[PDB]
Amino acid sequence: GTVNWSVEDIVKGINSNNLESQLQATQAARKLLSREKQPPIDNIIRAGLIPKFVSFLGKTDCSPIQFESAWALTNIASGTSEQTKAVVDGGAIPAFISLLASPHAHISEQAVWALGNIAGDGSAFRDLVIKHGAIDPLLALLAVPDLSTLACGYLRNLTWTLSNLCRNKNPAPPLDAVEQILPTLVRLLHHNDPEVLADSCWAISYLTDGPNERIEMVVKKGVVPQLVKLLGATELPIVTPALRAIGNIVTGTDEQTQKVIDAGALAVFPSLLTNPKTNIQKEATWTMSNITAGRQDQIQQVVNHGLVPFLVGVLSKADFKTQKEAAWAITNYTSGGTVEQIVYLVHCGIIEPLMNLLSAKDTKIIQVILDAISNIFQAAEKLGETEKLSIMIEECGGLDKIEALQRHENESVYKASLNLIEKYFS
Amino acid sequence: EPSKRARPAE
Amino acid sequence: SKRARPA
């Protein structure tokens, strides 16, 4: 009936001024636009249909055409920036906001979905959706005693749309919008649906990806313990954004970092640092490097949790980018740690895998590693045990690796090497 | 993570 | 000495 129409026929129906003809043609357009293989978004735009679809959003007496056109425009707005812009340019933003209050749940949901795609295009449309007043009516849809009474799909769409209002930078979302959304996000973060939890974590990860003040707005809401709980989830789609959020937080102050340690996050790292997903291991190791960049009592907690052997493990065998993060973790540890903590690192077997990575092609990791060796040596100096460390380094082939580094391109690389050699390996 | 989502045909 | 996430 409305299956496989030509764009020509859709236009003919939409221009008929018979509202039932328009309805059938709009549904035909929805069907074309919801096909998986190359929906003809550009042909529909070029046919001039967006203004008609937008006017149909306002037809309160014909809820079916509101739904069909909301679906058609949602799928156009799901495309390239230029496609989403065509939708915004036709006036869709206030028309979708008005539909948020529709008595028909399927129409309200579809308007939530369309605004999620518009806001998801980037900072400018995100902020334009906010200026048109989307937040108050979106939040009102979630103002129920128990989220479990909402249809599951509807709640997932609302959560996803809210996450796009939290997403993107340059600029980050307006501070007042973030403050307005946060109590609802905290509540969604405690909901029991895996997809709501994942998108709630994504939203929190965006809000903490920024300067310390943005992190504090989130940490002050008390969400860190729940994020640490979700870090432990079996679902990779939840662990991924929960870990990014935790990693973001520990880029903040020493005090923000302590909240993450206090909430028990370090106990999850034996698993994260051996996680079969490369991206999780790499993110977890980056996060460890920011914790070892912390205070001596925070380095002590990394020790107490048994995490130094795990760092030795990642240095010994991991994806190269993960080994690079491990190298930073070690350099930060040795830069901030006490001599006891540093000695401990050597006793855990850090020296050999550190030396092995000196054959890396990457120049930056060479610098980082040489920096750590220098720090370890300075610790050894204070103990009078410089010589023992020299032998350890020579025995595992490390001196050979360093001596050769005197013939490297980079200045800092050659300079740092010769300093090591002349000061410790006469 | 995709920031846009199309609603697919049922 | 905290570092941003790598590209």
Curated annotation (Swiss-Prot), chain A:
GO terms for biological process: entry of viral genome into host nucleus through nuclear pore complex via importin; positive regulation of viral life cycle; postsynapse to nucleus signaling pathway; protein import into nucleus. ARM repeats lie at residues 1-40, 41-80, 81-122, 129-173, 175-211, 212-251, 254-293, 296-338, 339-385, 386-425. Coiled coil: none annotated. Residues 244-332 are annotated as: NLS binding site (minor). Keywords: Acetylation, Cytoplasm, Nucleus, Phosphoprotein, Protein transport, Repeat, Transport, Ubl conjugation. Ubiquitinated. Deubiquitinated by USP22; leading to stabilization and increased activity. One of its GO terms (cellular component) is NLS-dependent protein nuclear import complex. GO terms for molecular function: DNA-binding transcription factor binding; nuclear import signal receptor activity. Residues 71-167 are annotated as: NLS binding site (major). It is found in: Cytoplasm; Nucleus. It comes from the Eukaryota. Slightly detected in brain but not in cerebellum and skeletal muscle, highly expressed in testis and spleen. Functions in nuclear protein import as an adapter protein for nuclear receptor KPNB1. Binds specifically and directly to substrates containing either a simple or bipartite NLS motif. Docking of the importin/substrate complex to the nuclear pore complex (NPC) is mediated by KPNB1 through binding to nucleoporin FxFG repeats and the complex is subsequently translocated through the pore by an energy requiring, Ran-dependent mechanism. Consists of an N-terminal hydrophilic region, a hydrophobic central region composed of 10 repeats, and a short hydrophilic C-terminus. The N-terminal hydrophilic region contains the importin beta binding domain (IBB domain), which is sufficient for binding importin beta and essential for nuclear protein import. Belongs to the importin alpha family. Heterodimer; with KPNB1. Component of a complex containing CSE1L, RAN and KPNA2. Interacts directly with CSE1L. Interacts with PLAG1. Interacts with APEX1 (via N-terminus). Interacts with FRG1 (via N-terminus). Interacts with ARL4A, CTNNBL1 and NBN. Interacts with ANP32E. Interacts with SNAI1 (via zinc fingers). Interacts with SNAI2 (via zinc fingers). Interacts with BAG6. Interacts with AIFM2; this interaction likely mediates the translocation of AIFM2 into the nucleus upon oxidative stress. Interacts with RSL1D1. This is Importin subunit alpha-1. It comes from Mus musculus (Mouse). The chain holds residues 72 to 497 of 529 of the full protein.
From Swiss-Prot, chain C:
The chain holds residues 101 to 107 of 252 of the full protein. It comes from the Eukaryota. Belongs to the dUTPase family. Found in a variety of tissues. Isoform 3 expression is constitutive, while isoform 2 expression correlates with the onset of DNA replication (at protein level). Isoform 2 degradation coincides with the cessation of nuclear DNA replication (at protein level). Homotrimer. Phosphorylation in mature T-cells occurs in a cell cycle-dependent manner. Isoform 3 is not phosphorylated. Each trimer binds three substrate molecules. The ligands are bound between subunits, and for each substrate molecule, residues from adjacent subunits contribute to the binding interactions. The gene is DUT. Transmembrane segments: none annotated. It is linked to Bone marrow failure and diabetes mellitus syndrome: A form of bone marrow failure syndrome, a heterogeneous group of life-threatening disorders characterized by hematopoietic defects in association with a range of variable extra-hematopoietic manifestations. BMFDMS is an autosomal recessive form characterized by various degrees of bone marrow failure, ranging from dyserythropoiesis to bone marrow aplasia, with onset in infancy or early childhood, and non-autoimmune insulin-dependent diabetes mellitus appearing in the first or second decades. This is Deoxyuridine 5'-triphosphate nucleotidohydrolase, mitochondrial. Catalyzes the cleavage of 2'-deoxyuridine 5'-triphosphate (dUTP) into 2'-deoxyuridine 5'-monophosphate (dUMP) and inorganic pyrophosphate and through its action efficiently prevents uracil misincorporation into DNA and at the same time provides dUMP, the substrate for de novo thymidylate biosynthesis. Inhibits peroxisome proliferator-activated receptor (PPAR) activity by binding of its N-terminal to PPAR, preventing the latter's dimerization with retinoid X receptor. Essential for embryonic development.
